[PDB]
Design a protein around this ligand. Structure first.
Ligand SMILES: [Mg+2]
Ligand SMILES: [Mg+2]
Ligand SMILES: [Mg+2]
Ligand SMILES: [Mg+2]
Ligand SMILES: [Mg+2]
Ligand SMILES: [Mg+2]
Ligand SMILES: [Mg+2]
Ligand SMILES: [Mg+2]
Ligand SMILES: [Mg+2]
Ligand SMILES: [Mg+2]
Ligand SMILES: [Mg+2]
Lengths: 142, 101, 126, 48, 50, 106, 186
RNA sequence: AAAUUGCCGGGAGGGAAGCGGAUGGGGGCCGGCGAUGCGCCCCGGC
RNA sequence: UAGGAGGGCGCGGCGGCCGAUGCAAAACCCGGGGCGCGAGCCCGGGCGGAGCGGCCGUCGGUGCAGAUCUUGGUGGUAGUA
C-alpha cells in the first residue's frame, strides 16, 4: 500500500473483486468480503484485507491435518507482494497455538484490533480441522 | 407500424472530453497501478509477483515466440494471471453470442 | 448452529398485499400496484377495502429478514462462497443456489456440516 | 535528493552488470482519482 | 501492468513532473491532489491535532 | 403502611444499618475493606465469535408470596382444579416455596 | 391532532455531505468531522460547512484581492475554502502563507517564488487545529456572470438586470422599452 | 403460457358472486417443524 | 388529488468482477416453504434438454388494466335464431 490505508479503503469500499453482495442495495443488503487475509470476512475498514497495512490471516492449511497457518503482513515490504506475508504453519495443541497468536497479534502491539477476532477464527478453524478428521459426533443445536 | 420516435443516425454516438482531462485520467490510471492493493482489489492474481511496480529488463524486447513469452511470464509472477485469463474464457451469454461477440 | 437471536420475532401483518381487483380479473396479477384513481375507494381508504401498505407496517430492525430458523439467509453457489460463513453461523444461514448441480451440492453440504453452518437445503435434490 | 528506487528483474541467460534501481517516476505518484476515471472512461468508451 | 526497463525509464520523459514544460505533452503538469498526505492516522493522531 | 415502609426503608441512615456497614467496619480494622481481582483462570477452551456473555447467577432476591389473610393452619380449603376439585381438605402449613400444603386426610 | 406546518419538521435544506464523490475531499470531510466534534473550534465548523459546498458557492479568489486582505497581517495564515488564481495585475506580493483547496500552477509558482508557503487543508489542520492565527477568506460570490441575470425583472423600472440577448447590437433589444423615441423607457 | 372446455376427487349454495378484518372447522403442507448437549470428575488408553 | 424531489425493485445490452451449467441450464406450472411495509426476491417440487445468472460502472426502442387501442386466440350467447 504505497497510498495509505484510508485511501485504499476509500478507493475499494464500493466494488472490490473479493466482495460478495446480495439482496440488492436495499435494507436487505448482505455484504461479505472473501479475501484470505480478512478474519470475520466482514467488509469494513477494521477487518479489510486490502485497505490495511497490518492484517492477520488464519487459514486451515493445504493438504495436511491439524495444521493452521497464521500469517501477518509486514508493514515495510508492501510493494513486494511475494514477500509481504509472514506465514507460520503451527500444528501444536490449541492452547499453545492461541498463545502464539496472542504473541503475534496483541502482545507485540502489531495489531491489538484483532486480538479477539483472530482467536475466534482460530477456534473455528481448529474445530473445522478436528471435525474434518473425526466426523460429526455432536450436532451442537442445543 | 413505426416505433415511437424512431431512432436516427444523428444521435450523439461520440462524446468529447477535454484533452487535459484525458491526460489527468490517464495519469491517475497510471498512479493507481503502482499500488499492489488496488491491483489486487481490481481482481488480478498477484501473490507471487516479486515487486511493484514490476519491471523487467529490456532483453524481454527481443523474444519472438509465445513459448518464449510464457517462459518470460514464469519468471515474473504473472503467469497465474495469464492462466486465469485463459481458463476463464467462455461464450458470451445473451444476444451477444450471435452478434459476432 | 445455535441462533444468536435473543429477540422474539413479531410481525405486524402476515397476509400479503395483493393488488386491488386482482380477484375479479385474471389479467391483473397479484403483485401490488398502488391505485392511482381519482374515485378509487382503495386509495381513499374507506373501511372495508383492500388495505394499502404504509411504512407503519415495517418490522423491527433487529428482527428483520430472519427466517423462522432465526438466521438471516445468504445464498451460496459453491464451497468457496460457503467457507466465508464460519464466524457467522450463529446469525447467518447458507442456502445453496437454485441452479447448482447435485454433485456440487454434496460438496457444499459436506463442507457445511463440518464448518457447522446451518443450511436449509441439505435435503434438496436427493 | 532522494526518490525510491524500483528494482528491475533480469531473466535467465542475462549478462551480469553493475546496474542499480530505476528511480520512481512522478506520474507513478500522481493522485488516484476514481470519479474522474469513471467519468472519462464512460465518455472514451462511447467513442468507438 | 508489466513494464519493460526501456519504457519505465522514459515514463518521466513522457509525463514530466510538477514543472512547466517538463513533459513531452504540451500544456500539462501532473495534477496535484487536495491533500499532500492522506494518512488520517497521522493527522488525527499526531501531536498537533491531539 | 406501604409508603411509610417505603420511606423508612429509603432513609440513607437506615440503609447504612440494613446493609450493615458496621461489622464491616469491624473486621478490616477501622475502615471498609478493599476488593480484589478474581477470575484469574486464564484458560479459555474455545473462543466464540459473538461477544461473550457469561451465565446469570441471578442476584435478585424476590420477596416471598403473601399467604392470604383468610388462611390459617387448620383452615378447611376447597380445591378447585385438578383431579381433587370440590374436595375439602385441611391446610397444614404454607411451605418454603410459597405453595400451600394440604391434606385430606387420605 | 396537533397544529404544525409539515408536522414541525424542518423544510429548509442544506448539504450535510458533499455531492462530489472525490476521495480526497471525503477524507477531508472525515478529518473535519473529527476536528469539529472533539475540538469545538468554530473555525473548523466553518471549514466543514464550507467543504459541503458547490463550486459556485466557492468562487476563486485572486492574488490581487488576497494581497489586499493580507497587507500587514503576515503572522496570520490565510484560509480560503476554494481556489487561488494568480494575477499579473500585481507586481510585489508579500511572502505569504495560504491554505486552499486548489492552486493554479501559475498562482502556486507566483507564491512559492514570493517565498511564502502553499498549504493544503491537511497541512493546515496540523498547525491550526483550532484556527490559531488564521484569516478565513471567501471569494466574491455574486461576481459570476450568471449572477447579473438575477433580481427583479429586466424590464421593470428601477431594476438594472441584464437581459438574455443572443447578441449585443442595435437590433437586439434596443427599441421599445429602451428609449422614449420608441414607446417608453422601460 | 393464458383466457376457454372435459373427466376424476372435494367444498357450498332461500332473488347475485367476488373483496377486506376476526378466529373456527376441514384439507395440503412444513423435521433448521423441535433438544438431547455442557461442564467437573474415575479409569483406559491416545 | 394536481404537482415536486429523494431512495429503491424490475427488463435488454456494453466495459469489468464473481461464478452456476447434461449429477440438468433457460423458459413455464404449483394447495410447496420463506424474506421484504412494497416494487420484488430466495429456495423446493415438476415438466423441460441448452445455455444462464449475481455485483460495480454505463447506456436504452425498459415496467400496462383501460386509448369505440393494433394483431391473434377463446368464451357466454347457443345446440339457440
Ligand atoms: Mg416494422
Ligand atoms: Mg374526487
Ligand atoms: Mg399525530
Ligand atoms: Mg418610466
Ligand atoms: Mg387453463
Ligand atoms: Mg363436481
Ligand atoms: Mg370473506
Ligand atoms: Mg385460517
Ligand atoms: Mg416504449
Ligand atoms: Mg435495443
Ligand atoms: Mg392490457
Amino acid at each position: 500500500t504505497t497510498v495509505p490505508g484510508s485511501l485504499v479503503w476509500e478507493l475499494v469500499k464500493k466494488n472490490n473483486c473479493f466482495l460478495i453482495k446480495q439482496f440488492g442495495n436495499s435494507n436487505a443488503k448482505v455484504q461479505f468480503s472473501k479475501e484470505p487475509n480478512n478474519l470475520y470476512n466482514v467488509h469494513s475498514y477494521k477487518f479489510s484485507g486490502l485497505a490495511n497495512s497490518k492484517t492477520v490471516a488464519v487459514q486451515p492449511s493445504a493438504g495436511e491435518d491439524k495444521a493452521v497457518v497464521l500469517s501477518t503482513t509486514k508493514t515495510k515490504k508492501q510493494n513486494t507482494p511475494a514477500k509481504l506475508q509472514h506465514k507460520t504453519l503451527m500444528r501444536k495443541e490449541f492452547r499453545k497455538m492461541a498463545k502464539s497468536v496472542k504473541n503475534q497479534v496483541c502482545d507485540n502491539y502489531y495489531r491489538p484490533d484483532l486480538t479477539k477476532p483472530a482467536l475466534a477464527r482460530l477456534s473455528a478453524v481448529y474445530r473445522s480441522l478436528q471435525v474434518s478428521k473425526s466426523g460429526i459426533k455432536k450436532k451442537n443445536r442445543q | 407500424g413505426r416505433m415511437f420516435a424512431p431512432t436516427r443516425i444523428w444521435r450523439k454516438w461520440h462524446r468529447r472530453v477535454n484533452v487535459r482531462l484525458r491526460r489527468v485520467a490517464v495519469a491517475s490510471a497510471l498512479a493507481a497501478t503502482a499500488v499492489p492493493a488496488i491491483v489486487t482489489a481490481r481482481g488480478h492474481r498477484i501473490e507471487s509477483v516479486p515487486e511493484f511496480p514490476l519491471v523487467v529488463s529490456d532483453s524481454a524486447e527481443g523474444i519472438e515466440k509465445t513459448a518464449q513469452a510464457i517462459k518470460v511470464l514464469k519468471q515474473l509472477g504473472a503467469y497465474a494471471d495469464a492462466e486465469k485469463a485463459k481458463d476463464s474464457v467462455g461464450i458470451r451469454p445473451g444476444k451477444g453470442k450471435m452478434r459476432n461477440r | 448452529a445455535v441462533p444468536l437471536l435473543t429477540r422474539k420475532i413479531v410481525k405486524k401483518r402476515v397476509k400479503h398485499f395483493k393488488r386491488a381487483h386482482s380477484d375479479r380479473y385474471i389479467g391483473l396479477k397479484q403483485s401490488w400496484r398502488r391505485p392511482k384513481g381519482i374515485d378509487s375507494r382503495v386509495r381513499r381508504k374507506f373501511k372495508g377495502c383492500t388495505l394499502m401498505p404504509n411504512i407503519g407496517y415495517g418490522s423491527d430492525k433487529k428482527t428483520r429478514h430472519y427466517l423462522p430458523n432465526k438466521f438471516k439467509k445468504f445464498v451460496v453457489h459453491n464451497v468457496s462462497e460457503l467457507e466465508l460463513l464460519m464466524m457467522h453461523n450463529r446469525t447467518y444461514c447458507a442456502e445453496i443456489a437454485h441452479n447448482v448441480s447435485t454433485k456440487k451440492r454434496k460438496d457444499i453440504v459436506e463442507r457445511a456440516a463440518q464448518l457447522d453452518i446451518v443450511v436449509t437445503n441439505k435435503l434438496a435434490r436427493l | 535528493t532522494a526518490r525510491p528506487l524500483v528494482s528491475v528483474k533480469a531473466l535467465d541467460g542475462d549478462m551480469a552488470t553493475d546496474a542499480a534501481g530505476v528511480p520512481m517516476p512522478h506520474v507513478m505518484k500522481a493522485p488516484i482519482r476514481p470519479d474522474v476515471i469513471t467519468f472519462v472512461h464512460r465518455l472514451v468508451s462511447c467513442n468507438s | 501492468v508489466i513494464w519493460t526497463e526501456s519504457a519505465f525509464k522514459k515514463l518521466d520523459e513522457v509525463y514530466g513532473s510538477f514543472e512547466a514544460s517538463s513533459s513531452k505533452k504540451k500544456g500539462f503538469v501532473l495534477p496535484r491532489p487536495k491533500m499532500t498526505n492522506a494518512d488520517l492516522g497521522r493527522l488525527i493522531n499526531s501531536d498537533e491535532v491531539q | 403502611s406501604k409508603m411509610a415502609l417505603g420511606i423508612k426503608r429509603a432513609s440513607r441512615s437506615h440503609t447504612y444499618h440494613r446493609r450493615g456497614l458496621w461489622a464491616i467496619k469491624a473486621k478490616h480494622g477501622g475502615a471498609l475493606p478493599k476488593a480484589e481481582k478474581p477470575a484469574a483462570v486464564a484458560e479459555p477452551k474455545f473462543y466464540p465469535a459473538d461477544d461473550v456473555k457469561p451465565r446469570t447467577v441471578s442476584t435478585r432476591k424476590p420477596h416471598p408470596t403473601k399467604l392470604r389473610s383468610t388462611i390459617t393452619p387448620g383452615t378447611v380449603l376447597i380445591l378447585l382444579a385438578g383431579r381433587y376439585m370440590g374436595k375439602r381438605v385441611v391446610f397444614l402449613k404454607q411451605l418454603q416455596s410459597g405453595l400451600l400444603l394440604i391434606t385430606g386426610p387420605f | 391532532g396537533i397544529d404544525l406546518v409539515a408536522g414541525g419538521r424542518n423544510k429548509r435544506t442544506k448539504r450535510t455531505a458533499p455531492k462530489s464523490d472525490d476521495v480526497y475531499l471525503k477524507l477531508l470531510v472525515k478529518l473535519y468531522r473529527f476536528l469539529v466534534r472533539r475540538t469545538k473550534s468554530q473555525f473548523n465548523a466553518v471549514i466543514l460547512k464550507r467543504l459541503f459546498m458547490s463550486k459556485t458557492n466557492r468562487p476563486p479568489l485572486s492574488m490581487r484581492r488576497l494581497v489586499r486582505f493580507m497587507e500587514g497581517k503576515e503572522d496570520k495564515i490565510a484560509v480560503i475554502v476554494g481556489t487561488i488564481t494568480d494575477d499579473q495585475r500585481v507586481y510585489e506580493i508579500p511572502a505569504m502563507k495560504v491554505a486552499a483547496l486548489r492552486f493554479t500552477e501559475t498562482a502556486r509558482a507566483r507564491i512559492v517564488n514570493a517565498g511564502g508557503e502553499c498549504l493544503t487543508f491537511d497541512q493546515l489542520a496540523l498547525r491550526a487545529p483550532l484556527g490559531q492565527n488564521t484569516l478565513l477568506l471567501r471569494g466574491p460570490k455574486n461576481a459570476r456572470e450568471a449572477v447579473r441575470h438575477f433580481g427583479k425583472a429586466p424590464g421593470v423600472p428601477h431594476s438594472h438586470t441584464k437581459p438574455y440577448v443572443r447578441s449585443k447590437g442595435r437590433k437586439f433589444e434596443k427599441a421599445r422599452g429602451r428609449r422614449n423615441s420608441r414607446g417608453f423607457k422601460v
